[PDB]
Amino acid sequence: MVSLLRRTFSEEIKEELVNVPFGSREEVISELLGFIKARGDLDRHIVFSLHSFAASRRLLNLMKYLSKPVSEIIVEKSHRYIKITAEYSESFMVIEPFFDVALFVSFLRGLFLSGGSMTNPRYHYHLEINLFEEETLALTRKSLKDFFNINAGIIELRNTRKLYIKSIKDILVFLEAIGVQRKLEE
Ligand code: NA
């Protein structure tokens, strides 16, 4: 049998995010684009390959709210990730959440759930988000600096790309913006 329980710091944070209430339709669609850009694969449908059980639960709620049929939810044994396959509508692909702080925030939330991780900050200050497309990467950094004064970097390693945050004051600002409350762990 295959376990869905990871006890990492990253999950503890992501479990707290599963519950944040949804917002406008457009805020929901921007988060979904987060998931799509961090972990989506078009070929309908979109197939989402998630490492986070919590992100995975959030995705299914995103799809419920949007009335989007989920085709399949398979857990791949280590003996992990979770493959969710989902219908979509093309208007989802083309929302631009970079110029409205609420849509951007919603979009950061999707990036981080689906492709983000963070080291336990007692040991080391490090938050990254898997995000491959350079246009999207550059727009997100601009909007982070712009709205939040957050200096985001780029990790480039072996045909992968991560958006990167080093500063704990920055990680804090970011985690508060996407909805984390129990970061009173400070
Ligand atoms: Na590190």
Swiss-Prot record:
GO terms for biological process: cell division; regulation of sporulation. Keywords: Cell cycle, Cell division, DNA-binding. Disulfide bonds: none annotated. One of its GO terms (molecular function) is DNA binding. Involved in cell division and chromosome segregation. Belongs to the WhiA family. Contains a degenerated N-terminal LAGLIDADG homing endonuclease (LHE) domain, a linker region and a C-terminal helix-turn-helix (HTH) domain. This is Probable cell division protein WhiA. It comes from Thermotoga maritima (strain ATCC 43589 / DSM 3109 / JCM 10099 / NBRC 100826 / MSB8). The gene is whiA. The chain holds residues 1 to 193 of 295 of the full protein.
